[PDB]
């Protein structure tokens, strides 16, 4: 009902937060801001941010450099940052199993090193999704942080990442303690609404409808709760405005905005306005978060 996320902060029981959607809408700018708000409010705890998107752009939002290992933000000590890549797992592995792999391939070729060089250049499809799951599991095991925030990649990939543990436990248990229990506990938490939650981001256009419906349907399957959604790139103009451009775009948005409210009225829908400049630096973040707790005052508001 209320267009805000204030109900999220009060529930300290949360452990996993997600932010997903299409590209070019503010998945990164939104996630990073929400984390800062939760940290300054709970200074006696730890918090972690993490990026699973290959187009790592968090460093450009904070104006600070980050690496493949967890670091600390200069502006605040409570918060930490991190970004996962695929050029470190292979680097650390740099084989024993790969060698045996060739033997299996050569075998069938008969019944029907040089390959090591292929490992150098990489270019192995799916490696980004495979190695990423490995890194998280190592970080998920540690129990020093309280919660974790994710800046996920497009929906086309984040879903396949969520289904991975459900299939690994299946084949593992079908072919077969510390490892299986870890993953089993993880999939258990991602499904409980009191611990996990998924949030969406979109813009007032036509493609938002089809994408949002497909997203919710695929989440209800996995039994994951979607309790809210975020809209961005909104204009605060009206027919009374003299600028023809600002007037035309507004009429195009008042249409789709009303549609979404009627369908998912049960969800917490929030509206974020458009800003003059970009969002770079802690200065602009703490101002972007105020719109998520206390709603902005638009022209048509009352």
């Amino acid at each position: 009902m209320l267009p805000s996320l204030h109900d999220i902060l009060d529930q300290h029981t949360y452990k996993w937060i997600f932010f997903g959607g299409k590209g070019g809408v503010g998945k990164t700018t939104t996630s990073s801001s929400f984390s800062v708000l939760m940290a300054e409010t709970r200074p006696n705890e730890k918090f972690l941010l993490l990026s699973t998107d290959p187009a790592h752009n968090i460093s450009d939002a904070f104006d600070q450099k980050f690496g493949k290992a967890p670091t600390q933000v200069s502006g605040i000590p409570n918060l930490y940052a991190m970004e996962v890549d695929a050029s470190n797992e292979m680097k650390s592995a740099v084989x024993x199993x790969x060698x045996x792999x060739x033997x299996x391939x050569x075998x069938x070729x008969x019944x029907x090193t040089c390959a090591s060089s292929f490992i150098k250049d990489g270019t192995f499809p799916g490696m980004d999704e495979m190695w990423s799951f490995i890194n998280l599991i190592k970080l998920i095991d540690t129990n020093e942080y309280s919660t974790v925030i994710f800046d996920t990649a497009p929906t086309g990939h984040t879903l396949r990442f969520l289904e991975l543990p459900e299939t690994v436990n299946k084949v593992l248990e079908i072919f077969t303690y510390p490892k299986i229990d870890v993953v089993k506990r993880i999939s258990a938490e991602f499904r409980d609404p009191s611990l996990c939650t998924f949030v969406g981001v979109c813009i007032p256009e036509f493609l938002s409808l089809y994408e949002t419906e497909r997203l919710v349907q695929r989440l209800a399957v996995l039994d994951m709760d979607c309790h809210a959604i975020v809209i961005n790139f909104v204009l605060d103009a009206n027919a009374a405005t003299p600028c023809s451009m600002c007037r035309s775009r507004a009429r195009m948005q008042n249409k789709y905005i009303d549609q979404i409210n009627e369908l998912y009225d049960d969800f917490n829908i929030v509206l974020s306005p458009l800003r003059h400049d970009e969002v770079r630096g802690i200065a602009n973040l703490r101002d972007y978060a105020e719109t998520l707790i206390k709603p902005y005052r638009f022209c048509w508001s009352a």
């Binding site: 391939x105 192995f124 799951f133």
Partner: peptide, 22 residues
């Protein structure tokens, strides 16, 4: 697609093999 199928088998093996790392 025949040789590519072997490549598909080569890539399909990496997926199954990488599972042991878990």
């Amino acid at each position: 697609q025949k040789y590519l199928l072997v490549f598909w088998i080569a890539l399909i093996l990496l997926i199954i093999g990488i599972y042991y790392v878990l």
